[PDB]
């Protein structure tokens, strides 16, 4: 019965909202009320990497904070070395429309994907001496919007056909498929223990999926536009999502509730990338204002601006040790800040 | 003295410089190719259109490439057929395209849309046109409007008047008064009158004039942008 089902779904929504309120108390601002602020964080451009002559759409640091990989729509993946500038590898792509890249934790594989609906897994350590296409995973209908490694033999992709998929590099098939999103999925962020992963769709929602069984566990809602970037808190118990309404929100896994919103009545453009810093005190968000901002994860006040970019910034990363922050915009020129 | 690098690091610098050059030489070859988009309303002669300028180059894949060469000019043409997702997310990828071919079949004025009612195909194509023509990205990009299915429309005019699609039409139901009216109705949606231009064209004739038209128009766009966006620089 459509009417009966709608009524009971409405009552379930009412009761879940009532429970979320029933677990509500004083928020972060009522606990951060008395703590000295960090101050003013001034950053400087330590290095500048050039040679892409196109738009930069992704980047990912390695486990050791020395090597990074960048993807651009000139048909190029480039493995920069953060110290100095030399390039270790320049991989050409069969499809020149790429929107994702990823560095394997072991450092042996790289990944790419785009409008071709196909995820390419490139090998790096070969006998012959060249970078080969180790695997070409196909099976998605829409474009690939995010792609993150989980091991040396598993990989989680989130695509534009409103689905996520946990693959299996050896066999090549979808080991598991996560569905439940009524919109395009454009984000992905794995937990430090690599058992739960959260994804933000195009319908203003963030879902926490369990990798083992493959069933949705928690849904966090509230926004005024799409979601473009998601990143886990280093503790692995919270995350921060960036949207198109110039607001970055913080959600908690154990509370099922919003905690803080880092919004100012001076910025109207959306957010293209979001990334925490080590120890979980600074939230770095890249905007369409050709610059990125640094927010206090507790006091929710701006405390720094990095404005060395000409066009819109599209990718933002923080190294594992927290030494530096690397940004990439739509006019090449990856910049490392410290 | 500057000689603080080992032999291996100097070889690494050698590798880096070889790489970037190879990259620069490759990227130079990718700037001499004219890139076109292939937007179409669907259920048109898009397959016939791509076949017409394919002979000159003697799951869902999504983006489909088509390379061809005419009069020592290299055209890459991108077709997006299988993309059923939201258009607001990947439409800014084609920011630097030279021109947007827009295919419209002028035989669907009376044929209502399938899996729907009271929604003509021509109205949907008009909405698509006044949905990409006013994009904040495609502001200086020209549109080449292709108008297909000449013979079928010519036959259908004598059987079905044009008053069904355009009840406000006042002219006679024949040729040279319906095609021109359709083109005029398709040209008023161009809000950016001062920057972009519409190179309307009639086609479906089994000739080789379609590729010649694309050639002419792309040459004009190129010249105008050069002489407007460049000074002394």
């Amino acid at each position, epitope marked *: 019965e459509l009417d009966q089902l709608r009524q009971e779904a409405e009552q379930l929504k009412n009761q879940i909202r009532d429970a979320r309120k029933a677990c509500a108390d004083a928020t972060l601002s009522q606990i951060t009320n008395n703590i000295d602020p960090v101050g003013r964080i001034q950053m400087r451009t330590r290095r500048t990497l050039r040679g892409h002559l196109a738009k930069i759409y992704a980047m990912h640091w390695g486990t050791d904070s020395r090597l990074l990989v960048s993807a651009s729509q000139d048909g190029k993946l480039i493995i920069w070395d953060s110290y100095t500038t030399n390039k270790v590898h320049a991989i050409p792509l069969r499809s020149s429309w790429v929107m994702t890249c990823a560095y394997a934790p072991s450092g042996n594989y790289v990944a790419c994907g785009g409008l071709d609906n196909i995820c390419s897994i490139y090998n790096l350590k070969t006998r012959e001496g060249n970078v080969r296409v180790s695997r070409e995973l196909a099976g998605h209908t829409g474009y690939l919007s995010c792609c993150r490694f989980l091991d040396d033999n598993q990989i989680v992709t989130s695509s534009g056909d409103t689905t996520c998929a946990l693959w299996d590099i050896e066999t090549g098939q979808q080991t598991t498929t996560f569905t439940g999103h009524t919109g395009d999925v454009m984000s992905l962020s794995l937990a430090p223990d690599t058992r739960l992963f959260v994804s933000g769709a195009c319908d203003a929602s963030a879902k926490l999926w369990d990798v083992r069984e493959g069933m949705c566990r928690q849904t966090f809602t509230g926004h005024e536009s799409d979601i473009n970037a998601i990143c886990f808190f280093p503790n692995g118990n919270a995350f921060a999502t960036g949207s198109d309404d110039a607001t970055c929100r913080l959600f908690d896994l154990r509370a099922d509730q919003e905690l803080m919103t880092y919004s100012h009545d001076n910025i109207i453009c959306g957010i293209t990338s979001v990334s925490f810093s080590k120890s979980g005190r600074l939230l770095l968000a890249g905007y369409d204002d050709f610059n990125c901002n640094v927010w206090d994860a507790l006091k929710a006040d701006r405390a720094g601006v990095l404005a060395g970019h000409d066009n819109r910034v599209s990718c933002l990363g923080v190294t594992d040790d927290g030494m530096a922050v690397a940004t990439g915009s739509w006019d090449s020129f990856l910049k490392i800040w410290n | 003295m500057g000689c603080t690098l*080992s032999a291996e690091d100097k*070889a*690494a610098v*050698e*590798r880096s410089k*070889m790489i970037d050059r190879n990259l620069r030489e490759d990227g130079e070859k990718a700037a001499r190719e004219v890139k076109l988009l292939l937007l179409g309303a669907g259920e048109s002669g898009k397959s016939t259109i791509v076949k017409q300028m394919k002979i000159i180059h003697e799951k869902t894949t999504g983006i489909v490439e088509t390379h061809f060469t005419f009069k020592d000019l290299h055209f890459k043409m991108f077709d997006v057929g299988a993309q059923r997702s939201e258009r607001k997310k990947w439409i800014h990828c084609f920011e630097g395209v030279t021109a947007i071919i827009f295919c419209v079949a002028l035989s669907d004025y009376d044929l209502v849309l399938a899996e729907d009612e009271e929604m003509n195909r021509m109205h949907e194509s008009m909405k698509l046109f006044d949905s990409i023509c006013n994009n904040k990205w495609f502001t200086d990009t020209s549109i080449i409007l292709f108008l297909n299915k000449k013979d079928l429309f010519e036959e259908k005019i004598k059987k079905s008047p044009l008053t069904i699609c355009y009840p406000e039409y006042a002219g006679s139901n024949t040729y040279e008064e319906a095609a021109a009216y359709i083109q005029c109705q398709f040209e008023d949606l161009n809000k950016r009158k001062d920057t972009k231009e519409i190179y309307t064209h009639f086609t479906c004739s089994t000739d080789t004039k379609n590729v010649q038209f694309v050639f002419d128009a792309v040459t004009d766009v190129i010249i105008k942008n050069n002489l407007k966006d460049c000074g002394l620089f």
Partner: single-chain antibody
Amino acid sequence: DVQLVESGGGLVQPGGSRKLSCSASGFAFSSFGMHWVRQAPEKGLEWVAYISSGSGTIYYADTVKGRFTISRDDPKNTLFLQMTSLRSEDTAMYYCVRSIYYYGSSPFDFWGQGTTLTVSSSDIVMTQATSSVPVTPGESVSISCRSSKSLLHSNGNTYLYWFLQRPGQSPQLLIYRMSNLASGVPDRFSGSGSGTAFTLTISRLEAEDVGVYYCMQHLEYPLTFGAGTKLEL
């Protein structure tokens, strides 16, 4: 299938000329730097010449400079050594060695099978005091190499390499940068050391580990080998 095959060796009258070839079969000749390495009939290894990838950088041993020329034919995947005014000091086994230099690479990893030349009748010194040592299978043995100059560079890398030559076989690299294990070399090998003093440890030595072990340096490109520590029994 990565084999490098040498050819052109043989008996040559003193003062003559001979050309040695090295036909790479089964990988990209380009994107690699090449080295020649010489071994007297009853003496250790001795580097001869080096040509970088793209032929942009070339180096020679001072005992062969002026007489020798090294070259590569990348389309044909061949490496050439043209050899003139052959003295009696040039009778040896010549080995063709590949080496690729980028961050984290393994230079000198693969060695060719070598060709024989018989001619009818400053530099860092690598010291291996132990000319031979008796070892029983199952035991653990340590080989010591000593340097006349600190191999540890300012960038953190200590350019020491360990190679194993089983008798009647080509040299096989064991360790690069004094600590990193090669691919396909069992974990029972290990390398350690401070500046100017290095040790290679074989734990639970078993058969096919017997032979001559060489220590080679690269603090500065010039590479000199050790005398060679030989293991038997």
